[PDB]
Design a protein around this nucleic acid. Structure first.
Ligand SMILES: [Mg+2]
Length: 212
RNA sequence: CAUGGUUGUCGUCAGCUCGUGUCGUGAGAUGUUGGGUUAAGUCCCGCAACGAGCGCAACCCUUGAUUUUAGUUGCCAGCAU
């Protein structure tokens, strides 16, 4: 399967090139098979306790894929910017959670109107801006028991903070990326639209098989 | 030039900070920079930061038009004197 140019590759993935071609490297699919075996097994073994599982899709080409798998799988996700402090500053992110909860309870259950225009002026624009980040994780009460990423080159903050928390992380890696930070890495290109979906399908099946 | 309290002053300038987080051996930084915009760290997009406080703004008084209430010590149109 494809990779990225020979101009900016990472030698940590010498294990994973296979039979290169015009400008772009290609990946050892059998290695990929074994890695997805370990990762699928481990995802199932993690979520067998009904844990909390977080997805990252900060990259354009996998926003939609991550979102679709996450809504099908009932486990939390992110696609817009990674708020620096998601899990380290989780206290204050959870303050923001409580705030959003208060707003959407105040609009319907408590009194909707207390000001003359402030509701549709500011409260709704703010609630848009909150959903523009918090997405799925609004109902993630505790920390994750495991994390999925799609591009540890783009998503280094999420990777780094999960590492500091010693949360187990997993994720696809293009040739530019670095697996040594990842625990149960999967070699594959992350810029194509079909493949990232094709992997998160299996990795959401892994949790759906056992959330029951 | 021991002090309180009161006061000018930079300057009604838009700035000064902080909890948690992160980077840095560390002091420190981040946030508070940037691109725009605004009278204004005002507000939006973006960002290893997310948020908050003091300030800014607004709530106050006054002036600027008008409705209802009340019409004397004010007013005088329609009226006589
Ligand atoms: Mg003021």
């Amino acid at each position: 399967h494809f990779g990225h140019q020979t101009r900016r590759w990472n030698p940590k993935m010498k294990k994973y090139i296979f039979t290169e071609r015009n400008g772009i490297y290609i990946i050892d699919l059998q290695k990929t098979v074994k890695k997805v075996d370990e990762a699928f097994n481990f995802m199932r073994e993690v979520a067998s306790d009904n844990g909390t599982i977080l997805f990252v899709g900060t990259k354009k080409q996998a926003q939609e894929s991550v979102r679709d798998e996450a809504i099908r799988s009932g486990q939390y996700f992110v696609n817009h910017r990674w708020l620096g402090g998601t899990l380290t500053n989780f206290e204050t992110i959870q303050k923001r959670i409580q705030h959003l909860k208060k707003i959407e309870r105040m609009e319907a259950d408590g009194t909707f109107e207390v000001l003359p225009k402030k509701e549709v002026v500011l409260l709704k624009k703010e609630q848009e801006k909150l959903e523009r980040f918090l997405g799925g994780i609004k109902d993630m009460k505790g920390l994750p028991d495991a994390l999925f990423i799609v591009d540890p080159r783009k998503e280094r903050i999420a990777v780094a903070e999960a590492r500091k928390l010693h949360i187990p992380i997993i994720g696809i890696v293009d040739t530019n990326c670095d697996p040594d930070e990842i625990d149960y890495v999967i070699p594959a290109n992350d810029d194509a639209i079909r493949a990232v979906k094709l992997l998160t399908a299996k990795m959401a099946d892994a949790i759906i098989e056992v959330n029951q």
